[model samples]
Target: DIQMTQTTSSLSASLGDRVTISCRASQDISNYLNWYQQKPDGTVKLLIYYTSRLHSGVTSRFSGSGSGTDYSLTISNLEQEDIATYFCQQGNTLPWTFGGGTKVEIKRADAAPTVSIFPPSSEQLTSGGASVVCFLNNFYPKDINVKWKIDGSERQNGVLNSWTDQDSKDSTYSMSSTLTLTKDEYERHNSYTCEATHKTSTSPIVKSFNRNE
Candidate 1:
C-alpha cells in the first residue's frame, strides 16, 4: 500500500477564512485522489473525487486540485459548519491508501498541550526491555497527534496511543502514548523523541530522551 502523508495535521481558521489541506502520496497516484470530510458526530461526506471533481451534494466552497503525487483540498470561504477532519485517499492501485488526516477547527484561544516524556520504570527495564511513555495534557480542540522518533527518524513499531480523554471541569483533553523497545534497541539509539502536534502550536512540541543524558 502506498503511504499518504498530510503535512498539516491540524488547521485553525475563522468562519470567513480560506482553508487548504494538502496530501502527498509516496509515489505517483495521478488523478486517483479523493477527499472526504468527517464530522464530529461520526458522519463522513465525500467532498471530491478523481482529484478535482466535486461529489454530488457537496458545497461549491469546497474544491480539490493537483495531480501525480501531490493534491490539495481548498475550502474557499470557510463556514462554521465546515469544522471537521479532512483526509485524502488514493485509489490508483490494489491496496488503497489514506492520509493521516487534517483537522479543521474554528479559531479560538486554544491551549497548547504540555508534553512530558517518562523513561522506563525500574521494573520495566529489569524485565529485559523498556517502555517509554509520552503524556500530553490540557490541550483544547481535542485534535492532536503523538509520534515517536528514534535517532531522528520516525518509528511505528511497538507504539500504542490512547484515545483522547476530556476533563469535565475545563473541557481540555489529554492522552498518552507508549513506545516499547527491546534492550538492544534501547541501548543502540542515540536519542528518542516524542513529538506532539496540536492546533494551538505553530510547531510540534518535542521532548527527547538522549542516551547520553
Candidate 2:
C-alpha cells in the first residue's frame, strides 16, 4: 500500500481557509478515499474519503476530489470549531498512512501559538460482550487507535467502528472492518491507548496551541 504525507505551509483561507490534502495510492483502490482528524491525545475523527464523498456525519465544509491515484479534500469555512489540526487517510493498507496534518488556527505573526492542546481523555466501551473498546471523539490532528495490552504484550484489537462511515449522517456507504478476537481473549488483553501527532503549517493562521513554549 502506498502512503501519503501532507506537510503544508498553508491549507486555510481568509473567509474559510480552503486547504487541500492530496494522497496517491500505489495501486488503484477504485476511488476509495478517507479523511480523519486527530486531537492532541490520540482521538481520531473521520472526515472525508471515498473519492468525492464526505464521511457519514460530516459537515458540507468538508469535501474530497480526485480519483485513481490522486485525491484531495477541501474544508469550506474554517471556524473556531475548525481551529484544530486536520489529516487525510486512504482506504489502502500498511505503509499506507495518514497525511501529517494541516493546523488551522486563528492567525498569528512570528509563527507561534498562544494556547495549547489538552490531552484527550480515553474512554472504554463494550459491544458484543468480549471486545473492550477505547474512543476519543471530535478531536483535532490526533487519532484514537484501540489495542489490547497484556502483561507487557499488546494484542491488536478489532477496529469494529470503522465498519461504519460515522463521518456522514445523510445516508450510508457500505464499509466494513473486522476483529477476530474471542471474548475471552478480548478481556484477557487489557490496557489500551490512542496515539497522536500534529504537523505545523509553514504559513500559519492566527491563534495558537502549545507552540508558544
Candidate 3:
C-alpha cells in the first residue's frame, strides 16, 4: 500500500494567513492527488482534484500544486469558516491511501484556560464504575496538555482527551479529559487531580476531587 505522509498534523493560522500543507507519497503518484476539507460537523468537501484543479463550488483561496510523490494544498487569505481539518488522498494505484489529517486552527493571542471538574454522574456510579470529566475552556493556540493523577501520582489508563475548534463567537478553543475508574478503584482512591498545562500559564492548572469532599 502506498502511504501518504503528512508531517504537520496541526497548524495555527490567522485571518489572511496564507498556509500550505505538505503531503508526500511513498512513491511517485503523478498528478493523482486530491485534497479535501472536513468540517467539525462531519462534512467532507472536495477542494482539489488531480493535483491542481479546483473542485466545483470551492473558493479561489483554496488551491493545490504538486506532482510526482510530493503535493501541497495552499489556503490563501484564511477566514473564520476555513478553520477545519484537511487531508490529501492518492488515487494513483490500488488501495488508495490518504494522508493523516491536518487540523488548521486560528492563531490567537495567548489565553489561559478555565479549568473545571465534574463529578461522575449517578448513573455511572450505579453502573459499577465512575467517570470524571475535566473541562478546559477558552484557551488559545490549541496546544495544551492534560494529565490525570490518583493519590497525587500520574495516571494513563482509562483516560480520554478531546479538543474542539475555535468558538466563532470568541475565537477560543476548548478541550476535555474523561477519566474512568472502577467502583472499587474510585472508592479506594482518596484524591484525583487533573493537571492542565498551557503555554500562556506559568504554572499548570490543577483541580482535584476528594472522595470525602
Question: What is candidate 2's lDDT per residue for 168-204, written digit by digit as tens?
Answer: 2211122222334555554454333332222333442
- Model 1 ranges off by over 4 Å: 109-213
Quick one: best lDDT, which candidate?
3
Q: Give the TM-score of candidate 2.
A: 0.44
Per-residue lDDT of 92-203 in model 1, one digit per residue for the tens? 9878989989988666457888899988887877788888899898888777888899999999999988855334344467888999999778878878899988988789
Which residue pairs clash in candidate 3? none
Evaluated at residue 55, the lDDT of candidate 1 is 96
Clashes of 1: 0
Model 2 Cα shift for residue 31 (angstroms):
1.2
- Candidate 3 residue-wise lDDT at 123: 90
By TM-score rank, best first, the candidates go 3, 1, 2
TM-score of each: 0.54, 0.44, 0.75
Higher-scoring candidate on lDDT, 1 or 2: 1
After superposition, candidate 2 runs with Cα above 4 Å error: 7-12, 40-42, 93-96, 108-213
